[PDB]
Design a protein around this ligand. Structure first.
Ligand code: 824
Ligand code: 824
Lengths: 267, 267
């Protein structure tokens, strides 16, 4: 019962059109700036606790830092209203970002009945997702996502993948700006990406030991990258640069621009 | 069975004299540089996991950032050795700091049999501890300790309080260097400090609702600060600047330099 309201956010005046997503912490809404007609995703996060406050501001900071990359949703603005000032009786945080076309799974559902995904489509989806995570892992210190899953991936208005969910992410604070090149979590993200790749090819989750279908002749080109990302030993497991590198070579060999629109999800 | 060993740490060569503290993650040792004869605390942290790696490096970063303050142990150096190179079969992190005289509780035990602590001694111990936490809360972003307890407090060679345990601490990463003055955890630290003050005066923990003794004529000057730090509502609860400010005025009124040595713990 928050839809219908027009909300002030800086110099913006936004009509809350409908509910895109919910869960525990928060809701996300489709919103439209009344005057300019531009559309946005608006996440509204309620807090009664300083621990919630900290998690919420950390998510905003991560979104701010990662913005600008073609495969991360664009951060537009953020703002709050004190609990004394809201009709929740709670602190409200407002986070305004790029409105996407929808969740990637919705589109995968619809493609699915028309049969397996083209190798090329799998390549584009996976590369674009790996580029977004590479962007996080390249930060100083690296930002570890920790909740990579296909359901959280979005498809942008241009048909490219957009990573949006930084509420589980973490890294080192007050990092000095002495020597250190230690893994601090990246490799759990890679495992997660391995599951996504498996899932895109074979349309099930590799766990709940895994198994690439023994006679698969369509996604064979991905098999060794899958196994490499699903090494149980994390030192053996690939880095994101090791995954991206291989994805670039696969792309160059198939004459595919892997950052291009995934127009087959848009038909 | 790590005591006896001489360990290399940069250009330092340190003899591991004995075990000061242990627990889960780690051990802390008394160590002596063979050549210069200077003494240190040496914490050795074992890791088989990237999550442990991250927690460990975060503790080191916090120690680095907070160093220089008279009431935080001084960070001297840090270093690692890969799991392939150690006789644990695990990554080892070495953290070298100021060797203190001992834990504050040891000294409190010994004072205790000689009767209540002077108001002045309570003032010095509490102020000095609050100055260390103020130093954390003043960082940008603020560093939240989250495990303030009297057992973790140390007494320095000069007779002043030294805070050392930053393994539970946290704050916001990739903080932008837009507006925000939200509590993110400070107030739970203040509650913890309130318990410490109560404990120093009345030699028991206020919980496991609390109760300042109804006829106390010795620590009356602290009573309203206690209640103020133990507000159940965290917006009502004082900030560290609000606590330190009052402690300065109490000190000025009793003609006490509250940062001076606590020479009565040293008799
Ligand atoms: O930024 C977003 N743009 C979006 O379109 C979007 C966003 C987010 C989102 C927004 C802020 C933080 C985390 C997720 C969640 C979202 N769940 C969604 C569910 C359906 C949908 O069409 C879009 C989103 C969505
Ligand atoms: O830095 C320290 N100097 C110390 O004297 C010290 C330190 C620490 C410590 C060191 C690194 C990280 C966290 C705690 C723990 C410690 N437990 C201790 C227990 C007894 C003691 O006499 C000293 C310490 C001690």
């Amino acid at each position: 019962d928050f839809v219908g309201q027009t909300v002030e956010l800086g110099e913006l005046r936004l009509r809350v059109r409908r509910v895109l997503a919910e869960g525990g912490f928060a809701f996300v809404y489709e919103a439209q700036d009344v005057g300019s007609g531009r559309e946005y995703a608006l996440k509204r996060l309620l807090s009664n606790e300083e621990e919630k406050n900290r998690a919420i501001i950390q998510e905003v900071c991560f979104m701010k830092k990662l913005s600008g990359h073609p495969n991360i949703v664009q951060f537009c603005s953020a703002a709050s209203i004190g609990k004394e000032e809201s009709d929740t009786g709670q602190a409200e945080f407002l986070l305004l970002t790029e409105l996407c076309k929808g969740q990637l799974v919705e589109f995968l559902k619809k493609m699915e009945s028309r049969g397996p995904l083209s190798c090329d489509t799998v390549l584009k989806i996976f590369y674009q997702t790996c580029r977004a995570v590479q962007h996080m892992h390249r930060q100083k210190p690296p930002i570890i996502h920790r909740d990579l899953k296909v359901e959280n991936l979005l498809l942008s208005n241009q048909g490219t993948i957009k990573l949006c969910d930084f509420g589980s992410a973490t890294t080192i604070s007050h990092y000095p700006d002495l020597y250190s090149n230690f893994p601090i979590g990246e490799k759990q993200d890679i495992w997660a990406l391995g599951c996504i790749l498996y899932l895109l090819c074979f349309r099930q989750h590799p766990f709940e030991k895994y198994s690439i279908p023994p006679h698969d002749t369509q996604y064979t080109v991905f098999h060794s990258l899958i196994r490499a990302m699903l090494q149980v030993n994390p030192e053996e497991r690939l880095s994101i640069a090791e995954v991206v590198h291989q994805l670039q070579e696969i792309a160059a060999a198939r004459n595919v621009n892997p950052k291009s629109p995934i127009t087959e999800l848009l038909e």
